[PDB]
């Protein structure tokens, strides 16, 4: 706001700019291009849009924005050398909890499993106490047998009657079915990578991929004739919505905001 | 067809007649251990109350 | 404890049955979207689905449970069967625990409820791994999901209980 | 008769999965040998899964940038 004009910018191309102008010799004004495109011919109106536009039309004598140079602009305008080298590049978003150990088996499983802890030890206690032929397996001991046998540690009783071992033989096999899919789907867990691998197939995945809207990118993907780029546009061109963006910073923000969904 | 397509009256045709138109383990696969379970807690209590009446008489 | 161990069984049994009756007659068992006729929020019982947002807020329509025989599934939850059989015991246990005290003579009257107690919470348990297994063939249970659980660990207690007085019952007469 | 010992015995002996002659009958001491025996099923399941996940599965140019103890080089007069 204390600055009005050309000299009310900074960067890269500002000082280029000034430094072209003293080497040619010659006065300035930095005039933002209205569109905000960096330029295209777009081929139902045939029109030159953003800088190229105001270059051909010759509402401006010099673009000094980082243009790329393309074959279709230099048919149509003049390049110096290159002042700066690039290429198109791939951008993604860069980027436990602590009772994450309950994670293999679901919330619903672990209230099966303290309704079954408790349901089998009060059935051990009852088969094992109201028989006159018998009456160790008080409901304290039956809750400490029953949970002592669960994580397989093992008990200083075992049941003796036949309905008492029955209790013991199903829970004996059904503590060994959950302990084992319990370390089996935490493996799972512990197994299951970035690369043109969405990008060799490309995206493959939801990881849907944009460009600027009126870039030499964007018509460096519809001209191509190389399988993975043409594959890519074919791609870019249906998708719905448009993966396209209209700056810069909006694909940039994109990217950002879609949590590594976005390339 | 080329005024109707110039007018835009097949792409409004085709949209009216094709669009408007239109890994933690669960208990679901791990059900069956609490079938026997609870088939093992029937089946045992049987027991119980039938050598109970055997033991008695 | 003979007169505070009456006193807790009554209520118990009283308490667990009265839990239940209520778990299965509300409609309160899930939280998930759903269509009560376009879908909105909706909460969802053992018999009724009513919308609790948007136009149809109140209305309430019978679940449909029938959209292979392990069919079965779907028939048991369809009849639901269990969570009544579940009700149908604690009634009973509560008889035999009232007329604990009328024939005193016979001691097999408050084992009856004990085992019945027991064998209430077995079908409980049953009862909820079936509804669990149906439904999932994001979501959350709201209060009467819970009254159930909760009325399956007060009736194990009682029947706990019940049978704890049939052992000291005995003991003494042996004495 | 869970003395000093025998409780690092017993401990030992409850964390290894291998049970023990002795076990305990208080409220008290049975509450501290359930949390035990939970945690060591646990860690054991961890230990198992993740050396499995481990058994089924520089790196880079910049990592070599980075560095300076791998000399590198050129071609001379190049």
Same mark, same amino acid.
């Given at each position: ?111 099966? /499993?303290?309704?079954?802890? /408790? ?145 | ?57 | ?44 019982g053992l018999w009724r689905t009513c919308c609790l947002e948007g136009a149809f807020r109140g209305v309430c329509k019978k679940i449909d449970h029938f959209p292979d025989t392990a069919y079965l599934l779907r028939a048991v939850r369809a009849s639901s069967v269990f969570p009544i059989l579940s009700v149908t015991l604690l009634f009973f246990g509560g008889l035999c625990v009232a007329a604990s005290e009328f024939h005193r003579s016979r001691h097999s009257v408050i084992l009856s409820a004990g085992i019945f107690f027991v064998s209430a919470g077995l079908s409980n348990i049953i009862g909820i ?47």
């Amino acid at each position: 706001n204390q600055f009005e004009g050309n000299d009310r910018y900074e960067g890269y191309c500002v000082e280029l700019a000034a430094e072209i102008a003293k080497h040619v010799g010659y006065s300035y004004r930095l005039e933002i291009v209205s569109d905000g495109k960096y330029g295209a011919r777009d081929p139902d109106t045939k029109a030159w849009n953003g800088m190229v536009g105001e270059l051909v039309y010759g509402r401006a004598d010099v673009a000094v924005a980082p243009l790329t140079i393309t074959l279709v602009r230099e048919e149509v305008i003049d390049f110096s050398k290159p002042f700066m080298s690039l290429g198109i590049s791939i951008m993604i978003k860069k980027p436990p909890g602590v009772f994450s150990f309950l994670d293999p088996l679901a919330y619903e499983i672990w209230m099966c /499993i303290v309704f079954a802890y /408790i349901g089998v030890s009060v059935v051990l206690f009852l088969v094992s106490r109201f028989s006159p032929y018998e009456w160790e397996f008080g409901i304290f001991n039956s809750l400490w047998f029953s949970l002592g046998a669960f994580m397989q540690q093992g008990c200083d009783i075992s049941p003796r009657s036949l309905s008492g071992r029955i209790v013991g033989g199903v829970w004996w096999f059904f503590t060994l079915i959950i302990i084992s899919s319990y370390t089996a789907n935490l493996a799972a867990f512990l197994t299951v990578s970035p690369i043109e691998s969405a990008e060799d197939l490309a995206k493959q995945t939801e990881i849907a991929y944009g460009t600027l809207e009126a870039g030499s990118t964007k018509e460096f993907f519809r001209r191509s004739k190389i399988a993975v780029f043409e594959k890519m546009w074919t791609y870019m061109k249906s998708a719905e919505p448009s993966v396209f963006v209209r700056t810069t910073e909006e694909g940039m923000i994109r990217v950002r905001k879609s949590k590594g969904k976005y390339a | 067809v080329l005024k109707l397509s110039e007018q835009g009256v097949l792409d409004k045709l085709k949209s009216k007649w094709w669009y408007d138109k239109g890994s933690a383990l669960s208990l679901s696969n791990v059900a069956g251990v609490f079938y026997i379970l609870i088939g093992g807690l029937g089946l045992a209590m049987l027991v119980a109350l039938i050598e109970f009446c055997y033991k008695s008489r | 404890d003979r007169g505070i161990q009456m006193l807790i069984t009554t209520v118990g049994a009283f308490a667990a049955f009265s839990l239940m009756t209520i778990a299965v007659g509300t409609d309160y068992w899930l939280y998930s979207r759903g269509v009560c006729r376009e879908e909105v929020m909706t909460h969802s019982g053992l018999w009724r689905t009513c919308c609790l947002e948007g136009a149809f807020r109140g209305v309430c329509k019978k679940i449909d449970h029938f959209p292979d025989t392990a069919y079965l599934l779907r028939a048991v939850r369809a009849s639901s069967v269990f969570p009544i059989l579940s009700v149908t015991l604690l009634f009973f246990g509560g008889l035999c625990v009232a007329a604990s005290e009328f024939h005193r003579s016979r001691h097999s009257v408050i084992l009856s409820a004990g085992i019945f107690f027991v064998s209430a919470g077995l079908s409980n348990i049953i009862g909820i791994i079936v509804y669990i297994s149906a439904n999932a063939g994001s979501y959350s249970y709201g209060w009467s999901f819970y009254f159930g659980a909760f009325s399956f660990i007060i009736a194990e207690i009682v029947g706990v209980v019940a049978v704890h007085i049939y052992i000291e019952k005995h003991q003494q007469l042996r004495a």
